[PDB]
Design a protein around this ligand. Structure first.
Ligand SMILES: [Ca+2]
Ligand SMILES: [Ca+2]
Ligand SMILES: [Ca+2]
Ligand SMILES: [Ca+2]
Lengths: 222, 526, 527, 222
């Protein structure tokens, strides 16, 4: 039974600050904190294949390592499947022989879980392709869990991870779809990845998509 | 690991150097002040005593205040660590009825909160003015020398402070003359289980007032006067309420569920006398000629704990306490420049000021308000120059000139009266008007030659006032005999108002100080 | 670590060697005395007992005082560890009314003043009341037969002239007539008025209605009654006496955790007062306004170890810290007034002690050795203005003819209707009234008011000055001036030279009353 | 919440004594206690240069190791700058090829902090010159902190450490003053030293002269 004083110390600890690194510094620090959640297991493998992590300000489109590449891809969708204009976002991975990730800097990266979730999502892509696309085959290991989600009571799991397409594909999943569509199959991996990583969105995955979590849990730790 | 000597929750370094509270992403943030950043956002720079849990010596901590974790009824201005949060309750009488213990009298009363040329008193008081207009008193009541008068009235408690009151009401003394205590007014039930928040009445204006000796009640102690007292009451048409400072316990904030309950271990009685000894008091009748008292945390050089407070200037106090502001270098209160207000000090505070001015090589105070330091126990009074004040610091007069400008703007002149737009702050120092008709050689005839027939003025939902000539001219419009010679009208100031016939028993209007506000020959003009 | 024997918050070495509380960067700081730093800042050098949580044996610790962590109503001077902080409450009567126990009643204004005892201690404070004997016979106007019985009533206020406040309690007071005729016992109603009587304040405050013995609104109140004989004595003396005890209730204490100052139910004035009185030297000083102001300073008691652990205290020092004296240029004085303008009076024992010190000092004049004279617990010193003449209660009742005239030496606007002049408040106290006689050119005199009770012509004017009114007792008419040649004289009477009753003869004349010439003008342009 | 008995034991421990070494012994013991506050770091360096510590009684002037040397220096000022007659004091250091310190013996060396402070002061001199005067140069290290005291808000620091001279020297301090006046510059070092050493006068230094303390703190421990 915490006394009133004890409660005061708790809230003051949350509310009272002293030394401040200044806007700019905080921005950088915030970003760093995000990566700390991501297991270095993948980070090292990103730089290994020539991976660059940038934390620019303002519009991302307005960057040096990234100029005006295909205005088409500047139309995007968030981790929820809703559209968005790249110049207004805060994160993006780059598909090329020289893979590179760049993000905006904000105080919100410690307040807004939505943002972090979307950046872990992008990282999910990087892995699902820029690190998995290589020696994916036989690939059946993950292929089999994706099926359980398609055919099973409760659409939730596939309303959470699947696009407005795979859901409506009547037939069960052919072990050829992954070939024709390595794109979609890795978006899923990216999403499930984001949710598992984002600490608060983790249990959500364990609940709505027990299998996707059941796998992503084993996957990393071993 | 960071020094928080007073345990209020704000590190010492911040209280002394300057801090502010900001909300970013719906989260509270208390951090050091940074002009370029915070000024933009219109935030407030706070300074406070690192060795006082409550700088103003009130029941709320500096942290609770600036952060909002407090009784929501604590006035906005009192959310500033340097502005004291305490109740200022006084009694308001609306109507009064006198009878012989029909044949009774019912008059409307105008009670106003007063201020003491005296020092402290640990009490607030108000003066009641009884309507002397038409409906003789003792006569109408048929009071023989051996009689005895009964008294009763309707009242409301009003809190003009910065903190609320719970479940308790102050004891009030009804005084006649200098020290004739007629009655002692206490609250019934001992626990009404109500609340009197700052800036509110109790009971609220939409409810029935409180009556001394209620109808439904029968055991209530009747208020009685003797023949002589009644005579004085009629001679003066004025009473006085002396209300104490027993405000009961304080509603405190709880850090577990945000609940605000009355702390039985926290009492206004033990905190008030500390506020009064550590704060500078400023009284200001600028909002509506009503005396509003505020207290600011000011340093006391001889007291270490107190010299640990932020330095406070006269200009600053006015900003944070009464909401003054300097839009373009000019300190003002809602368009009204400081130069429109007088400064009045008690003896000691006055002497202090002089020494500051002298040491400042300044003569005009209005040009140095940001340099004038405040000290605990200072008493400052700020009034509108436009008016004359009495002993209680109430607007009861003004110079002839200012009144005229107010009346100068006429809107329509007939013989049924006068219609014009006049400031509300003027209608406060005026008891009524008297109108005479002057000949071409100087023959003047007052159309209402009684001291209690000046109430011809009447308000209006329009917002403008209309002087009625019919009222005391036997319902009929002003009959002009010759449109050549003029009709004169002039107002009577409250300090020059007469409520009882002369020693002669004379009811005439003559002798009464009046102030010209009209004159037209009568023809087309009139 | 560092020794704090009494656990007051101050190390031992500091209390004995000297210390002070300074504020740097809006942060309190308790530091050893450092002349080159602290004298500049006008700070005060403190010394106190390391073995007394409260060197003055009062409810406040040496630390709480010097630091400000204390009830803010504790007088500034009592923030010094060597100056005791305690209440000194006495009752002040303003007006009195006497009637025949069921007009014809009497209403007189009363002037009560706090007194001091040639006696030792008494654990009580007292005041004497003086009833106005001016015009409005008493028993006559009241029609009191030998078998009658008089009723009494009055308006009073409690006044605290001490250094500490009082809460929720008022002392019991005895109304005494003669030597020991206890007329009434005055207690506070409700048992708990829930108010405060701070030092230097009245209760109720002067802006509020006074307290009445047997209030109008109250009916059960016990009426105060005198018999025919008592009333006669009351009229013969025109004087009563209030004996107020020292039941001051509980003490408001400071609470560090939140700085709250609540009344400690476990702390009572009754258990602390008798310790103050046995460890302190008492100095009484009527220098501020001829009003007796009592103060107590912590003085050593050689026979008592705990007490000999206190700082050494000299007469000069006590005066500085207690009554705010000062020596601007070597000269000890109280607001321009040099010490040599004041008398010293001691009780027996303290007097003997002083003599031994002076003797051992090879000094005869005390005024030249105040910094060498040691104070001891239980000393009683009385310091009064030489100019004035005091009664047996040490109350200014008069002065020297020369000084009186000096005050009226400043006329303003003379007329035939009355005189007006700004007059020193100090003297007004010792004055009962004035008399004005018309003198012929050959030496005849015709006093305009030839009664002992027609002196009340002086009246304070809110402008800040006094106005004498000839009209008052001249049938509301201006003083008639037959011949502007022979002068019309005017002069006041001292309170000790004041007569309150008709002489043995029944003579009501003004003659016989010792007076002091303060005005005389031929009458013409001069008059 | 200490019971009444517990408080009694506390005070009795302060008040009640038993075995007594006798006046003379106590005198010596007292002196010793003082030195114990001084870090041996300097003591060894004093005897190293031929340093002798004496604890005589009565007038110091009346000594063997010190006879009648220059009656002029028998006029002195305390750590506060107030004059004093040597024959009435209780401490003094000796400037010569054979440096030597001698002090009076008293019970006050455990009661009076004023005295101890004045003796630590003298020791301060011994160091500032008889141990520093040697390899002082470049000496800029301390020279720079002394400046901050001269020019800065709050005169206190220089009202505490500076003489009635350096305070009034309008111009900032020339890096030549230390040469012309190694005397004054070392008096300061002596004073600041005394305050830092005297345990109770330490915080005082930290407050009124934060820099002087900030340095003297580092100085010794490293
Ligand atoms: Ca704090
Ligand atoms: Ca604070
Ligand atoms: Ca102590
Ligand atoms: Ca002590």
């Amino acid at each position: 039974n915490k006394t009133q004083e004890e409660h005061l110390k708790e809230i003051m600890k949350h509310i009272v600050k002293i030394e401040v690194k200044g806007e700019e510094a905080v921005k950088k620090e915030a970003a760093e904190k995000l990566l700390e959640k991501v297991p270095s297991d993948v980070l090292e493998m990103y730089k290994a294949i020539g991976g660059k992590i940038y934390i620019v300000d303002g519009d991302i489109t307005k960057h040096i390592s990234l100029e005006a590449l295909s205005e088409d891809k500047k139309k995007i969708k968030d981790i929820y499947g809703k559209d968005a204009l790249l110049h207004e976002h805060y994160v993006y991975a780059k598909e090329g022989y020289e893979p590179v990730l760049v993000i905006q800097s904000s105080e919100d990266y410690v307040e807004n879980t939505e943002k972090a979730l979307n950046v872990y999502y992008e990282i999910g892509k990087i892995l699902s392709r820029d690190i998995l696309s290589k020696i994916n085959q036989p690939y059946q290991k993950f292929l089999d869990v994706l099926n359980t989600i398609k055919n099973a009571s409760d659409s939730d799991g596939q309303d959470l991870l699947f696009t407005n397409q795979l859901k409506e594909h009547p037939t069960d999943f052919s072990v050829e779809f992954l070939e024709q569509n390595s794109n979609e199959v890795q978006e899923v991996f990216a999403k499930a990845f984001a949710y598992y990583i984002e600490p608060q969105h983790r249990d959500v995955l364990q609940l709505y998509a027990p299998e996707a979590f059941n796998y992503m849990d084993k996957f990393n730790e071993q | 690991t960071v020094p928080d000597r007073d345990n209020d929750g704000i590190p010492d370094s911040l209280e002394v150097e300057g801090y502010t509270v900001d909300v970013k992403n719906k989260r509270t943030f208390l951090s050091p002040w940074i002009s370029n950043i915070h000024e933009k956002k219109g935030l407030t720079k706070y300074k406070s005593s690192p060795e006082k849990w409550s700088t103003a010596s009130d029941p709320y901590s500096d942290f609770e205040k600036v952060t909002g974790r407090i009784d929501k009824n604590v006035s906005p201005e009192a959310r500033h660590p340097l502005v004291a949060a305490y109740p200022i309750v006084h009694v308001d009488m609306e109507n009064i009825i006198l009878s012989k213990n029909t044949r009774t009298i019912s008059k409307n009363t105008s009670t106003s909160r007063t201020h003491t040329s005296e020092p402290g008193s640990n009490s607030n008081s108000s003066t009641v003015a009884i309507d002397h207009s038409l409906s003789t008193w003792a006569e109408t009541m048929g009071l023989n020398t051996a009689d005895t008068a009964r008294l009763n009235a309707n009242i409301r408690y009003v809190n003009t402070g910065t903190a609320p009151i719970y479940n308790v009401l102050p004891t009030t003394s009804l005084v006649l003359g200098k020290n004739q205590t007629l009655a002692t007014i206490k609250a019934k039930e001992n626990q009404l289980s109500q609340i009197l928040a700052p800036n509110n009445y109790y009971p609220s204006k939409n409810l029935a007032p409180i009556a001394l000796n209620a109808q439904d009640d029968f055991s209530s102690t009747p208020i009685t006067m003797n023949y002589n007292q009644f005579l004085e009451l009629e001679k003066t048409k004025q009473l006085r309420l002396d209300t104490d400072q027993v405000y009961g316990n304080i509603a405190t904030y709880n850090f577990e569920n945000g609940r605000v309950r009355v702390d039985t271990g926290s009492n206004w009685s033990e905190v008030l006398p500390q506020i009064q000894e550590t704060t500078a008091r400023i009284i200001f009748n600028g909002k509506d000629l009503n005396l509003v008292e505020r207290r600011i945390a000011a340093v006391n050089p001889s007291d270490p704990l107190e010299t640990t407070k932020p330095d406070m200037t006269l200009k600053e106090a006015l900003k944070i306490a009464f909401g003054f502001n300097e839009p373009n270098g000019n300190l003002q209160y809602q368009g009204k420049d400081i130069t429109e207000f007088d400064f009045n000090f008690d003896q000691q505070t006055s002497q202090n000021i002089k020494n500051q001015l002298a040491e400042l090589n300044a003569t005009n105070i209005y040009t140095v308000l940001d340099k004038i330091k405040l000290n605990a126990k200072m008493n400052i009074l700020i009034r509108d120059k436009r008016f004359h004040y009495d002993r209680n610091n109430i607007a009861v007069g003004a110079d002839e000139s200012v009144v005229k400008e107010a009346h100068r703007e006429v809107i329509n002149s007939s013989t049924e009266g006068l219609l014009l737009n006049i400031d509300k702050d003027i209608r406060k120092i005026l008891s009524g008007y008297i109108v005479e008709i002057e000949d071409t050689e100087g023959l003047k005839e007052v159309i209402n030659d009684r001291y209690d027939m000046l109430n011809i003025s009447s308000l209006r939902q329009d917002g403008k006032t209309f002087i009625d000539f019919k009222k005391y001219n036997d319902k009929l419009p002003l009959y002009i005999s010759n449109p050549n010679y003029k009709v004169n009208v002039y107002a009577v100031t409250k300090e020059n108002t007469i409520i009882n016939p002369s020693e002669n028993g004379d009811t005439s209007t003559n002798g009464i100080k009046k102030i010209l506000i009209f004159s037209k020959k009568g023809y087309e003009i009139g």
